[PDB]
Design an enzyme around this catalytic site. Structure first.
Site, PDB file in Angstrom:
ATOM      1  N   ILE A   1     -12.674  -3.476  61.427  1.00  0.00           N
ATOM      2  CA  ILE A   1     -12.904  -3.887  62.810  1.00  0.00           C
ATOM      3  C   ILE A   1     -13.059  -2.714  63.765  1.00  0.00           C
ATOM      4  O   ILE A   1     -13.326  -2.926  64.950  1.00  0.00           O
ATOM      5  CB  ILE A   1     -11.788  -4.821  63.318  1.00  0.00           C
ATOM      6  CG1 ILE A   1     -10.452  -4.073  63.414  1.00  0.00           C
ATOM      7  CG2 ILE A   1     -11.712  -6.046  62.472  1.00  0.00           C
ATOM      8  CD1 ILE A   1      -9.422  -4.812  64.268  1.00  0.00           C
TER       9      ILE A   1
ATOM     10  N   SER B   1     -12.095   9.146  64.735  1.00  0.00           N
ATOM     11  CA  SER B   1     -11.847  10.431  64.086  1.00  0.00           C
ATOM     12  C   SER B   1     -10.626  10.397  63.173  1.00  0.00           C
ATOM     13  O   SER B   1     -10.544  11.193  62.233  1.00  0.00           O
ATOM     14  CB  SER B   1     -11.672  11.520  65.141  1.00  0.00           C
ATOM     15  OG  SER B   1     -10.905  11.012  66.232  1.00  0.00           O
TER      16      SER B   1
ATOM     17  N   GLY C   1      -9.584   7.733  61.217  1.00  0.00           N
ATOM     18  CA  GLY C   1      -9.761   6.920  60.029  1.00  0.00           C
ATOM     19  C   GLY C   1     -10.388   5.584  60.373  1.00  0.00           C
ATOM     20  O   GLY C   1     -11.377   5.534  61.111  1.00  0.00           O
TER      21      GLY C   1
ATOM     22  N   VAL D   1      -9.798   1.155  61.227  1.00  0.00           N
ATOM     23  CA  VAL D   1      -8.935   0.086  61.723  1.00  0.00           C
ATOM     24  C   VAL D   1      -9.326  -1.222  61.049  1.00  0.00           C
ATOM     25  O   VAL D   1     -10.515  -1.505  60.870  1.00  0.00           O
ATOM     26  CB  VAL D   1      -9.000  -0.041  63.255  1.00  0.00           C
ATOM     27  CG1 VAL D   1      -8.009  -1.102  63.746  1.00  0.00           C
ATOM     28  CG2 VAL D   1      -8.708   1.301  63.896  1.00  0.00           C
TER      29      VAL D   1
ATOM     30  N   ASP E   1      -4.952   7.721  77.531  1.00  0.00           N
ATOM     31  CA  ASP E   1      -6.215   7.072  77.177  1.00  0.00           C
ATOM     32  C   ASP E   1      -6.286   5.669  77.766  1.00  0.00           C
ATOM     33  O   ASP E   1      -6.713   4.720  77.098  1.00  0.00           O
ATOM     34  CB  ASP E   1      -6.432   7.018  75.671  1.00  0.00           C
ATOM     35  CG  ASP E   1      -7.886   6.854  75.314  1.00  0.00           C
ATOM     36  OD1 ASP E   1      -8.727   7.085  76.194  1.00  0.00           O
ATOM     37  OD2 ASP E   1      -8.196   6.521  74.152  1.00  0.00           O
TER      38      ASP E   1
HETATM   39  C1  G8B Z   1     -10.424   0.274  67.539  1.00  0.00           C
HETATM   40  O1  G8B Z   1      -9.093  -0.242  67.614  1.00  0.00           O
HETATM   41  C2  G8B Z   1      -8.071   0.655  67.663  1.00  0.00           C
HETATM   42  C3  G8B Z   1      -8.217   2.030  67.621  1.00  0.00           C
HETATM   43  C4  G8B Z   1      -7.105   2.834  67.684  1.00  0.00           C
HETATM   44  C5  G8B Z   1      -5.853   2.292  67.779  1.00  0.00           C
HETATM   45  C6  G8B Z   1      -5.684   0.927  67.820  1.00  0.00           C
HETATM   46  C7  G8B Z   1      -6.783   0.087  67.754  1.00  0.00           C
HETATM   47  N1  G8B Z   1      -6.716  -1.325  67.826  1.00  0.00           N
HETATM   48  C8  G8B Z   1      -5.599  -2.054  67.885  1.00  0.00           C
HETATM   49  O2  G8B Z   1      -4.447  -1.657  67.845  1.00  0.00           O
HETATM   50  C9  G8B Z   1      -5.864  -3.497  68.001  1.00  0.00           C
HETATM   51  N2  G8B Z   1      -7.153  -3.785  68.174  1.00  0.00           N
HETATM   52  C10 G8B Z   1      -7.507  -5.075  68.302  1.00  0.00           C
HETATM   53  C11 G8B Z   1      -8.944  -5.301  68.502  1.00  0.00           C
HETATM   54  C12 G8B Z   1      -9.357  -6.385  69.265  1.00  0.00           C
HETATM   55  C13 G8B Z   1     -10.685  -6.660  69.493  1.00  0.00           C
HETATM   56  C14 G8B Z   1     -11.637  -5.822  68.950  1.00  0.00           C
HETATM   57  S1  G8B Z   1     -13.353  -6.166  69.269  1.00  0.00           S
HETATM   58  O3  G8B Z   1     -13.967  -4.875  69.172  1.00  0.00           O
HETATM   59  O4  G8B Z   1     -13.354  -7.009  70.432  1.00  0.00           O
HETATM   60  N3  G8B Z   1     -14.067  -7.035  68.100  1.00  0.00           N
HETATM   61  C15 G8B Z   1     -14.264  -6.259  66.860  1.00  0.00           C
HETATM   62  C16 G8B Z   1     -15.000  -7.061  65.815  1.00  0.00           C
HETATM   63  N4  G8B Z   1     -14.324  -8.364  65.584  1.00  0.00           N
HETATM   64  C17 G8B Z   1     -14.982  -9.123  64.482  1.00  0.00           C
HETATM   65  C18 G8B Z   1     -14.278  -9.135  66.859  1.00  0.00           C
HETATM   66  C19 G8B Z   1     -13.546  -8.399  67.950  1.00  0.00           C
HETATM   67  C20 G8B Z   1     -11.257  -4.715  68.192  1.00  0.00           C
HETATM   68  C21 G8B Z   1      -9.912  -4.451  67.965  1.00  0.00           C
HETATM   69  C22 G8B Z   1      -6.529  -6.087  68.248  1.00  0.00           C
HETATM   70  N5  G8B Z   1      -5.220  -5.813  68.077  1.00  0.00           N
HETATM   71  C23 G8B Z   1      -4.851  -4.507  67.946  1.00  0.00           C
HETATM   72  N6  G8B Z   1      -3.561  -4.169  67.780  1.00  0.00           N
END
Ligand code: G8B
Ligand code: CL
EC number: 2.7.11.26
Length: 350
Positions: A28, A32, A34, A36, A147
């Site tokens: 998802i 840099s 790794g 997720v 951030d």
């Molecule tokens: C890039 O994410 C990170 C980078 C660094 C550190 C932490 C994180 N992320 C999280 O911690 C985290 N992220 C999400 C989260 C929520 C929505 C998206 S979306 O892009 O809307 N999209 C992606 C594709 N999908 C099919 C539908 C929705 C992406 C991710 C949820 N719960 C979490 N705890």
């Protein structure tokens, strides 16, 4: 429907590893560090994210350290962490398994902006207050996110709960040890960082939050710099050239060109005609050059723009109740406990 099982230490709790089983794993995100993933816990069927970062042995991971000590309704919980190896050679990965929250303020705000709509002010109040609440929490530990930006603000579209995520830039700001100046995403990067400051404070987070508020009000980023240095130009087009004294408070060692002399642009002309006065008022006390001038997160929560949220009759637009916004702990109120008289309205006390 393959089932993966790992031996994971609980997030907050005691160093007692347990086997945890999850399934339905999709990529998802990445970066840099790794990759997720999303996954479902075979046990409770709850959804989780897993941030998998290459962790060099013999040296500690500060994101994990910071995350183990956080517990707050507006921050994504670290439920477990675990190690694993593969895809590479004799390399160790650290995995953070976090609560999954399905939406982000970035995606929400893009959908309104594509449809040429303004996100209703009630959502602005709800998102911004919860963001300020999470900041007050981490800043009371001296932890600074570094951030704050729309993509790191997770939303539950039904409860309107906001949770702060991605602590890969967060740091314990310790007084007198320097910190890197080129952090924060460009659009949300405070001015002292652009001036190369290395002894900056948590108020760089409050600048970022103001950029997000402004962006929600306007339907686009308010300072869209096309480089790390042009970011400063965009800032100056609104705040005017910073005074020599303002440059000192941002960083007391600098000569960056000298900039052309530009008048400050009145805050009322910065936003759209029907923009609420308290939104603009709040915004102008966040987007200040002088980093000590900005409101603290708690003071921002006390702002009058948020008073509708303290109303006893307020409800979400889907008819449901507002999330819990008044259960302040003493650590949360620690910076300024008297603010409790405004932040916990009468109808919400015991
Ligand atoms: C890039 O994410 C990170 C980078 C660094 C550190 C932490 C994180 N992320 C999280 O911690 C985290 N992220 C999400 C989260 C929520 C929505 C998206 S979306 O892009 O809307 N999209 C992606 C594709 N999908 C099919 C539908 C929705 C992406 C991710 C949820 N719960 C979490 N705890
Ligand atoms: Cl809490």
């Amino acid at each position: 429907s393959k089932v993966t099982t790992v031996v994971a230490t609980p997030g907050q709790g005691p160093d007692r590893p347990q086997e945890v089983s999850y399934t339905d794993t999709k990529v998802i995100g990445n970066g840099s560090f790794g990759v997720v993933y999303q996954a479902k816990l075979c046990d409770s069927g709850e959804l989780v994210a897993i941030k998998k970062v290459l962790q060099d042995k013999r040296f500690k991971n500060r994101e994990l350290q910071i995350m183990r000590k956080l517990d707050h309704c507006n921050i994504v919980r670290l439920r477990y962490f675990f190690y694993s190896s593969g895809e590479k050679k004799d390399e160790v990965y650290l995995n953070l398994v976090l609560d999954y929250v399905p939406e982000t303020v970035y995606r929400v705000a893009r959908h309104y902006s594509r449809a040429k709509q303004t996100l209703p002010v009630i959502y602005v109040k709800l998102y911004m207050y919860q963001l300020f609440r999470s900041l007050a929490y981490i800043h009371s530990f001296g932890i600074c996110h570094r951030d704050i930006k729309p993509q790191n603000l997770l939303l539950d579209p039904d409860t309107a709960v906001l949770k702060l995520c991605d602590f890969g830039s967060a740091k314990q700001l310790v007084r007198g040890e320097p910190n890197v100046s080129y952090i924060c995403s460009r659009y949300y990067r405070a001015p002292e960082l652009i001036f190369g400051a290395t002894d900056y404070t948590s108020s760089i987070d409050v600048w970022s939050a103001g950029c997000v508020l402004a962006e929600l009000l306007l339907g686009q980023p308010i300072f869209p710099g096309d480089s790390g240095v042009d970011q400063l130009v965009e800032i100056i087009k609104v705040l005017g050239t910073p005074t020599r004294e303002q440059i000192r408070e941002m960083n007391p060692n600098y000569t960056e060109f000298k900039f052309p002399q530009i008048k400050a642009h009145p805050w009322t002309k910065v936003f759209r005609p029907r923009t609420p006065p308290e939104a603009i008022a709040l915004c102008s006390r966040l987007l200040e050059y002088t980093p000590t001038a900005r409101l603290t997160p708690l003071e921002a929560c006390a702002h009058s723009f948020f008073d509708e949220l303290r109303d006893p009759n307020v409800k979400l637009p889907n008819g449901r109740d507002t999330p819990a916004l008044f259960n302040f702990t003493t650590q949360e109120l620690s910076s300024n406990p008297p603010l409790a008289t405004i932040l916990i309205p009468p109808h919400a006390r015991i």
